[PDB]
From a paper:
The genes encoding proteins that form Rhodobacter capsulatus GTA particles (RcGTA) are derived from phage DNA, which has been integrated into the bacterial genome. Here, we use cryo-electron microscopy (cryo-EM) to determine the structures of RcGTA before and after DNA ejection, and to visualize the interactions of RcGTA with R. capsulatus cells.
The dodecamer of the adaptor proteins provides the binding site for a hexamer of stopper proteins, resulting in a symmetry mismatch between the two complexes. Adaptor loops from two neighboring adaptor proteins differ in their conformations and interact with one subunit of stopper protein. However, the long loop of the RcGTA stopper protein interacts with the tail terminator protein and does not block the central tail channel. Furthermore, the end of the DNA packaged in the native RcGTA particle extends through the channel formed by the hexamer of stopper proteins and continues into the disc of tail terminator proteins. A hexamer of tail terminator proteins (Rcc01690, g8) binds to the distal interface of the stopper proteins. Unlike other tail proteins of RcGTA, the tail terminator protein contains α-helices 1 and 2 in its N-terminus. α-helix 1 binds to the insertion loop of the stopper protein and α-helix 2 interacts with α-helix 3 from the same tail terminator protein.
Numbering used by the authors:
A (entry chain D), B (entry chain C), C (entry chain C): 1 to 171, 175 to 197
D (entry chain A): 199 to 393
E (entry chain B), F (entry chain A): 24 to 78, 89 to 393
The structure:
Amino acid sequence: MMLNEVTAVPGTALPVAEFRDHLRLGTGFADLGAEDAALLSYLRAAIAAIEGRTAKALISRGFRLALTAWRWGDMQTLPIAPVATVTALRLVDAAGVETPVAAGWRLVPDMARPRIEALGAMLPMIPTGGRVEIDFTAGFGASWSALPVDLAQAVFLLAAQYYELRHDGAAAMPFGVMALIERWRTVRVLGGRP
Amino acid sequence: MMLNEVTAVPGTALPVAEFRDHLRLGTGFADLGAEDAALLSYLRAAIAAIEGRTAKALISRGFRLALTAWRWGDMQTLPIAPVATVTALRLVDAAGVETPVAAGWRLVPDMARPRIEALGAMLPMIPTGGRVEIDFTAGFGASWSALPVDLAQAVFLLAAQYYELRHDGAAAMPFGVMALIERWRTVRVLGGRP
Amino acid sequence: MMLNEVTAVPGTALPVAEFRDHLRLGTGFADLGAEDAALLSYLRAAIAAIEGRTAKALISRGFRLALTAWRWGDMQTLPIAPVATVTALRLVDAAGVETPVAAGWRLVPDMARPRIEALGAMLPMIPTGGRVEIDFTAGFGASWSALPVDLAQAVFLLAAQYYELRHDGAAAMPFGVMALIERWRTVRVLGGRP
Amino acid sequence: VALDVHNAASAWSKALLDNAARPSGAIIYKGADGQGVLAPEQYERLIFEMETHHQGARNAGRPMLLEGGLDWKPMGFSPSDMEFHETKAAAAREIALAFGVPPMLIGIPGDATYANYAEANRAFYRLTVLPLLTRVSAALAWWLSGYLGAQIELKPDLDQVPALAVERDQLWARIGAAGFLSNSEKRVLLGLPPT
Amino acid sequence: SVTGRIVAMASGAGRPVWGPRDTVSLMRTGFAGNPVGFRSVKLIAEATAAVPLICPVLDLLRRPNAGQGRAELFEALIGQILLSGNGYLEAVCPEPGVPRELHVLRSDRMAVVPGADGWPVGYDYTVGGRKHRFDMTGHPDPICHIKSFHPTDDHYGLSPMQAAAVALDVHNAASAWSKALLDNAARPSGAIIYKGADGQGVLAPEQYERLIFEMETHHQGARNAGRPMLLEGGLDWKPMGFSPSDMEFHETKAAAAREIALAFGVPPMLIGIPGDATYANYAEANRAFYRLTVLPLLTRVSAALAWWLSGYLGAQIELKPDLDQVPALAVERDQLWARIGAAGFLSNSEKRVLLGLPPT
Amino acid sequence: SVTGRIVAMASGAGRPVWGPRDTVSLMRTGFAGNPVGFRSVKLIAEATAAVPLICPVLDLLRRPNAGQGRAELFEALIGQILLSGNGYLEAVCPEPGVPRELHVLRSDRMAVVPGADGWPVGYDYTVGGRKHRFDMTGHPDPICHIKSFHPTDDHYGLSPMQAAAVALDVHNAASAWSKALLDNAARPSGAIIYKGADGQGVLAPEQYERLIFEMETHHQGARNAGRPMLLEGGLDWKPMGFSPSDMEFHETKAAAAREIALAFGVPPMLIGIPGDATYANYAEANRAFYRLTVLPLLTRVSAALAWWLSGYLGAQIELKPDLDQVPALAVERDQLWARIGAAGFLSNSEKRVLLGLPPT
């Protein structure tokens, strides 16, 4: 289970022109672009902070889930939660040959449990000494407008903070950064074997 | 259970002209200068914070509840609470034949526990692999004026807070944001198997 | 188990030109005056503080893991976590004949527990006195842009702190340095014999 | 109901012995901060001084120096024995109650109701065996006589069944000691062919 | 027999029916694994072999085959019935009548065939991939199949170990709980905590070898039990305990060790498990053992040998346990001889016919 | 027989089959390691040697070889059966009938060969790397192979120590728990804490030898038990305790010490382990010992000596335990002589034939 990203976010999909409206920089100056190189450096640093505390994705970039042994006999819950249209469960071999498999696997969409449950009571078997990478595109939407807005606000509450204080300097809201995140975190109570 | 919204708000349904009056009317600097479309972006962030803490809907948007297995035998509590009129309970199969049903169920509306509660003991079974899918319209009313005004004030107490201070800065009111929400939260005491 | 690095960073791979922008860009005195090669000496001190607390590598440097006895029968978890492609598992004897092996093991990559996990139950045994030695390349990517951006921000929140104040002077942020690190630390609960 | 109590209380203790993490302690390592991991160099030092010098029967009670930051919190296991021990043993008696066997014959634990197995085996062949057997044999005496012409009776022997010997000692020594009535007058009482 | 044809088709005629898969694993985990399941079968199988029999045919039973005596045969035969609910006896007949070889075929590797009319036509001894297909479509029918009572299955027995299969896994794992607790446990008898001036501080390897040598020599061991142990500034000794000391699942093991003994039918007094005194003084518990779980088992197997072996002979033979000169039934023999011996009214030959003597 | 021919070719004909791996390690850890496993075998193996036998051939058994007597032979023979489930007896035959040598071959270094038809053709005595290959392709068959009952294996015994192998490792490690707790433990009887003006402060070696000498002389020992111990500023005495004092795995060892005695079948009263009173007064528990685990064991080995040694003779001989003048069965002999001796109705010669007397 490695879970790397195939492609990153384009950067042009991030709302730098709206984050600048948030931070109260300035309206009609002739410069207007001295911060563009750094404002998206804090938006990518605040999304990636909330992508890890919530285990959500938010831009629907493509992922690659390269794993070897199945976690449970048939289920295989995916880590990145809001998914749609798993592309390919290409089953690599011990070395080399990569054979994509329709394989009779389904996809159960959920924000909490994005399973990949199999229908033939057993997922496609795994060549001993070989991995099973799964290409899937997981996230809310393609553009910034398709997000839940409270999670989009939690980026703006957080990336404004990184813009206003640079080093770790200490400085209570009703719905702060944390209270907006908490309905998107994963609530789990299993430490067991299954 | 994905539960994505079919359509969002139009934006013209939101009380941006009224929220400018809750921001500075009768006392203030003047009407002053506020990026109008910015003020729409804080109302959508305060509603989506109260739509999540209360599990209400507040604008009567259209929903699509596509879940695989029925939880109870017949009950199926709907999460987004103030509901009216299931659009359709179409039932897709594993291939996508999408055969709707038109009888066998009677939505029992309620602000506490909206249900589906089919007739007798038979609720439409699920094609194996073929997720069931329920389209409904949930919320109070089409315009902003049809809301309970205490819940509308919790938006204005919250959307003004996101306007007055940007980052997560520190700052116990009797009926604050939190005290106006708690009579609209869902009070549940089940952690059990049914 | 010495685990010395083969090569360090080049120094030109580090974002000194970007860290000057995280130090004072968009707000500040001017670009101001900063001893450039000093700013490289605080990034190497903040990465090496986060390479130690997270047991990650972040630049994809080359390592050499020379240990005497295998801990398990076959497993051999690698400490530096994000790995890719064992360079060689050469096996030196007590005199230094250095006979490499080229098969019998299949590195199973993972950000949690990278392994060696030989085929079957036979992992290459050790010549008596002749330490085994594993060369691998561990880290995210060759350039600074291939990193998770939340972990990159923990460097910039920390390397700026070593720049802003020199001695150990006193000074609770929501996603501070410590809150961005904790989803990359290694969570272990074994104090046992295996 | 008493089967499902006894089945699940017995499966309670099975899966408790199979799903349970008790530790015999926990070496808490906070650090200078409130949180801090220890490096995998330090961690293999910490295993090897725990694997070799502290675990096992042969290392039971080493004095265990704890420097700054380290601390050992010993855990316990507060319900140790007796997980639904009496509710299983009460349900193990209600199953034996329903079929009518005494608790002494089957071997379940419990308070001494019957004394010395001359009773409990005699109670077993009088309250739940011989009433059961004389009811089935009364149906074989009537169903099989429908195949014959003449009707046949078919009853349990209630003689030379060795659990009823205490009802046979008690009846032979009563009439054998009754010396007033003569010899042939008591062979007809005990069931003997008269002479 | 008229309904025999209907159940045969559902299972599938001419094809082997296996029944329980996990039968071989209950043997290794429940009979070679724990002593209670081990002793309970060995206590019964060595008791049924010791009981004499009443009929020629017993000349076969006395010497069945090479290296497998009379008493050794029934231990193998009953030892399969208690373990897997099924007993098998192959007869090899070089001669036409009373075949001079008997072999207990183990019931792990034996499978039934339902056949046409529901009663079996084939038995399959399956070792490796190799089958044999014994045939029951004849008159001598070369294997006697002794079933324990099974209400739900139509072809096999129930094997009391299967009914106690939860209580075996409690007793196997509670006993392995205390084993691995004695092998994975770090108790210290204390901890010399060294904080320092800071909240954290190590002590130098000069100071650390000083701390071992005053602990190795002067404080550990039986002979240094209770030295007054000066603690300077920074040092502190926190003595640890071990709060559950005895009794790790002690009663749930002792309760599961009785439910295993319950299923095979041995009394708790015979096997040696601790427990409340149910039976009194071994004149009862040994007499209860040979009356509730040995002699009913032996009169059921001997009734199958009385019918299978009579199919090789011409005349049918009865074959029952002796229920006489079996020395566990002496309290039922005192009680019956002193009853009729004290009955002085009926004459001498009138009680020799009651006690079973040849009259004179 | 027919099934056996198929079984051979699965495992491999002509090649040695070893069976148990750990049987060389259960002896050192279960028979030389703990007293309960030691005494349990010694209690049985010294009981089977004491039982007389009923038949010439017994002249061999009385004096088998030099330095290995009659009673010493069965202690070696049963001592291998209880330890590793297998008994072996090599016979050296210079003469054709009744071979004048018997040797208990230890079952660690012996291995079977399945041969062609499944019944064994070879036994291999392997010490070091050196073999012997005894041959079974003849009539006298120079090794009797006494098997304990094993349901899963076709060539060996089950060895009750294997069934108690968890309870041995509990009893070995709980007993070694208390040994190393008495050997690795630092309890102090107190601690004189000296903080100082600072939070930390040592005391000078001038002051420290003053502190030892007032503690060595005036406070430690029986003769200084309870001195009032003035503590000035900075000094303080914190008395430590020892919270689990007795009873370190005391009942789990005593429950495991009973399960070892349970598996071999000895009663808890004979061996001397503590426990609840199951048997009453040793007229039963010694009679139970010679009826549930000695005489069934002895009548099974003697039935194999009656058949293996008769292969050297022409006529077959029976060889059974005496079951008479063995003084643990006197309570079964009182009970049977007083029953028939009090039966006055049947005459004098009619009861000498019942009790086993030569009639007159």
